[PDB]
């Protein structure tokens, strides 16, 4: 039900895969360049407008469940033209903040409930 | 019958291993002179430093088996039992219990022992301040708990210290007034002056005086957002003081940078909403400092946003002599020659500069005096 | 735990056995908290409680360990003759209240985070209704309206209506509408779920999701609804991209929405920008205007700040009549807080009310 | 545990021993709700049920701990004479209903989330069918038809027909159509699966995925299907 | 468990002891579907099968827990004459049919999303 993850083990810019309830979970320690770029976008382009602070509480750490939101298949990080996540099923592109920017996907990747424990993070 | 009456006359107390009192009492009894203990057990503390250096220390504690001590002229029977079935998974060790037995004709004489144990813990309260920073949406320690600095150490202009102290005390004492009115219980104090006037040092000293932690936030930070700003100043830790610095970042450009998308985004709307609306009101004291008051906006000096403003300019000769004797306690009449020397010098000097030139060598006061003629341009060389 | 704490405080008892329970919280600043409490611990004890002798026997298992508490299991066995009142209920209820002596009723304020709500700050202390001053009739009118609505619940259910209420509080700003909503919610024992449509990137789907998955026992407060209507014609050419949709709001208001006695309070400062289409039964049912400060408001608030100083209020009302100016509630409040216990000074600086927006 | 709760309710016992079960809920506002029940607990009790004497023997495991609740294992052992009717069935039944009576159940509204179906708000209370009115011959005209379809499963299945049925309600102005649908679904005890074809960002493949893979015993409702017809590729001729 | 289920329905049985097995499903809509089954439970039992009396025993193994099931380790046993046909094979075959009757052989249709098939 609850999965506990050590945050310190993750270096900057490195993604992770974690199974909560069996659902995949992505942990990314964002770099300031990513923060600036993501916050600098124009919401009009986004099919599902939302802001980085409202996607995730901590700009340092970025969380979501790895599902395309088009079908049940999972995307892959560090892929796609936008440098975020890409889906190899029907070519849905996700920006650095896991926001659908191009493709048939209707919604951004949803975020589960999570809590920060300093060195570690509790997801659930 | 014999056992029943025995237990009827005597108190018997138990201490599980979980309680800190267990270890505390073990340590205390190890120290007690009037002791008859023929059993011992070693406890060794290890910390292997990063470079391989290791610090070692050991101590002998009574350990399992019965003992005999006399406390305040009353005999006591210690009995340490080692569990033979349980493993305290939290401590990764078998469960233990140290039990005491005593006649109840006298009082248990036992809160006294545990107060003695408290005395070991009381020594650890020396650390008395912590700095909190906006690591993200919340506040976290910026570092090791700093040591508190005494208020007379920081020397501002006469009256400013007393006025600020009196005003903050007045605000804090009459909380029931705010509760009765229904008005939010928060107040603001604005410190404006030239740079290097010891404003932040003054705030830190005050926080030391009232024991509250300090919550630092710089509005020149380029990745602040008004929503996260409003979150932070309402999710603040208890017993804290919020210190805002370079509020002129909102005055000078306002939303111009926000529209341009260049560096920080915080603006007046963030100030207003995060000051009054939907804000934490149980308790809060906020401090603002601004190096460029000239860009002030007439909408802010109103109650609910801020109420106290005070100029902090160049150090007066009173401040000069006070800090001179701070660096050089005693040393009378050297301060006199110094003060008139700087009066002949007759230029604007920040307290930071005076501190620097009194500390740069750990000087003798006359040594600082000798070069005091260069204060016209001492910012260049020294 | 409750019963052990309770019996530790019982004067009429005998307990040969005892055990220590320590409270140890290390403050962040370096200070520390310590507190002892010698509970009876294992063994047997006797207690006489309003005439009845009870034997108390505490024991811990020698083979169980509780995973949660990380400690061996324990039980407390009371025993006494049948002929009593089954006084265990009395003892145990007494133990209940003493533990819950805190009486910590607060008023939480939630806030939207993505499609879900999140607690915002610590639970604020309750603020009672009289703390906020409004014009005559408006307050009590709203109170009786909402009371009638909640009480008349079965009426809605049986007669095929989804049992939703909508109250609009429109008027010039600086009238403390939000403060009044907070006071009302605290009075009714209801949490508040703020959601400002202004300057908030809301997608109508997400808006509907938030308003309908609201936590139970919580009042929904939409702030500045007119922003949506403004952006119906503005953002189409401006690009504020925080606009939501009016049609989505209607669907998010009526379509398939919640029905759990949901009560919604909406506020605005530009009623002209609103249209007479969202106004219907089941969405904005009872609206009221909230204008600038009135004589009633100024008298009542002056008494709130200076109880018993009726003559001083008379001089004050003479002064403000002499000024004969229009002022909102918030500006007039500043006079009395900066003169906490000095009403005579507020009387002295009545002329400054023209420039109240700058320094006062 | 329903047996314990029922036994607390049943009078005419000899319950010398007792045990407290506490429910403690911490509301976010600070207040807490507590309720206090005295259940038989360990030891041996007696019952006189319908003239039959039943002995009840609670037992607490001396070694085990149940991970499911982090508590020692327990057993409840009834005992009586074979000559009885084996009233155990009766007492278990009339204890079961007490648990059942607490929660009758309601109607749940599902809604689309990407490809998945998930609940949308707490279970809405059942809307009784008479509570919505329509023109004469209409409501019954649908009700009888759906009942016939419900019973004609054999008429479809044994002859290899797709056991599906589709309805259309094309009231122009909009008069309680959705209300009628929800009332009918509650009457049949079927959860409602809502979907609006006017929703932006709805693809044919995702639709086909969603119209199937529905939650069990659910009625699908497609609102304003005319969007599919009208909103042709001209609006998205670029490939939107 | 199939064996116990079969025995519950076997009429030529003498069983002084019983145990309650509950199948409970909670629907998402709040409606609950419940059933009870009086399996033999612990203690001795006698059953006649094909004219042969087969003693039966059930036993809850203390000092054990089946971690997967999360219950005390149970064990059942039967006993009868070696001289006459040990009909245990026949008994098990009978019990197996009680499980096999449940499935009618549903057809399952898979569909391709991504480079893998899944249930549809
Ligand atoms: S399922 Fe991933 S792009 Fe469509």
Numbering used by the authors:
A (entry chain H): 92 to 215
B (entry chain A): 75 to 456
C (entry chain B): 97 to 456
D (entry chain C): 97 to 336
E (entry chain D): 97 to 216
Structure paper excerpt:
For bc1 complex (complex III) assembly, the iron–sulfur protein Rip1 must first be imported into the mitochondrial matrix to fold and acquire its 2Fe–2S cluster, then translocated and inserted into the inner mitochondrial membrane (IM). This translocation of folded Rip1 is accomplished by Bcs1, an unusual heptameric AAA ATPase that couples ATP hydrolysis to translocation. Here, contrary to most AAA-ATPases that form hexameric rings with rather narrow central pores, Bcs1 was shown to form heptameric rings with a significantly wider pore and two large vestibules. One protomer consists of three domains, a transmembrane helix (TMH) at the N-terminus, a Bcs1-specific β-sheet-containing middle domain and a C-terminal AAA cassette.
In addition, no ADP density was found in the ATP-binding pocket of any of the seven protomers. Rip1-FeS introduces asymmetry in the matrix vestibule by exclusively contacting the AAA domains of four Bcs1 protomers, henceforth called protomers A–D. It binds to Bcs1 with the 2Fe–2S cluster binding subdomain (FeSD) tightly packing against protomers C and D while the large (base) domain (BD) is exposed to protomers A and B. Based on resolved secondary structure including several side chains in the Rip1-FeS density (left panel and Fig. EV3), we could position the FeS domain with its N- and C-termini facing towards the seal pore locking up the IM vestibule. In Bcs1, we identified two highly conserved charged motifs, the EWR motif (E212-R214) and the DDR motif (D300-R302), that contain residues exposed to the FeS domain of Rip1. Second, the EWR and DDR motifs—together with F209—formed a module that contributes to substrate contacts in all four interacting protomers. Thereby, a characteristic positive charge distribution pattern is established in the matrix vestibule that is complementary to several negatively charged residues, e.g., D139, D145, E201 and D210 in the Rieske substrate. Indeed, we found that Bcs1 charge inversion mutations in the EWR and the DDR motives were not viable in YP medium containing glycerol.
